[PDB]
């Protein structure tokens, strides 16, 4: 059940802490690293990976910007935001530009390879915290 991934965040080794996690899930490989946006869009037309995950928050343009460079370029790109920002301000947002999932930092770790292999299943994968804040928008709207 197999996957190569692509990682995009400046913070070198927290990148690092989370490529350990996601490859503690077997099948999984993380197979290029980035620390901005320019270096993402290269590195996705050279390694075209089965799914890409972004910060949002990025020294230049941030993963919002990326991902609607890459879709231009490939409009079947997976890419998982991958934050510690909240609200369903941005992930609307993200959403809307491409991103096929928005998932936050500080969620339960599992999170993340849940949303990575639930978007590689073909679903948009959102944590609990931010379901809950665009569920309880829509409510209130």
Same mark, same amino acid.
Do not use: C, N
């Given at each position: 059940?197999?996957?190569?991934?692509?990682?995009?965040?400046?913070?070198?080794?927290?990148?690092?802490? %989370?490529?350990? /996690?996601?490859?503690?899930?077997?099948? %999984?490989?993380?197979?290029?690293?980035?620390?901005?946006? *320019?270096?993402? %869009?290269?590195?996705?037309?050279?390694?075209? #990976?089965d799914?890409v995950?972004?910060?949002?928050? /990025? #020294?230049?343009?941030?993963?919002?910007?990326?991902?609607?460079?890459?879709?231009?370029?490939?409009?079947?790109?997976?890419? /998982?935001?991958?934050?510690?920002?909240?609200?369903?301000?941005?992930?609307?947002?993200?959403?809307?530009?491409?991103?096929?999932? %928005?998932?936050?930092?500080?969620?339960? #770790?599992?999170?993340?390879?849940?949303?990575?292999?639930?978007?590689?299943? *073909?679903?948009?994968?959102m944590?609990p915290?931010?379901?809950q804040?665009?569920?309880?928008?829509?409510?209130? *709207?």
């Amino acid at each position: 059940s197999t996957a190569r991934i692509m990682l995009v965040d400046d913070h070198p080794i927290v990148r690092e802490g %989370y490529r350990r /996690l996601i490859e503690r899930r077997p099948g %999984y490989a993380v197979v290029a690293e980035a620390a901005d946006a *320019g270096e993402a %869009y290269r590195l996705y037309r050279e390694t075209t #990976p089965d799914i890409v995950v972004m910060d949002l928050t /990025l #020294p230049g343009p941030g993963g919002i910007e990326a991902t609607r460079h890459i879709r231009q370029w490939d409009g079947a790109a997976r890419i /998982l935001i991958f934050t510690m920002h909240q609200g369903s301000a941005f992930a609307l947002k993200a959403f809307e530009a491409g991103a096929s999932g %928005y998932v936050t930092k500080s969620s339960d #770790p599992a999170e993340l390879v849940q949303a990575i292999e639930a978007i590689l299943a *073909g679903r948009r994968a959102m944590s609990p915290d931010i379901a809950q804040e665009i569920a309880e928008e829509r409510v209130e *709207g």
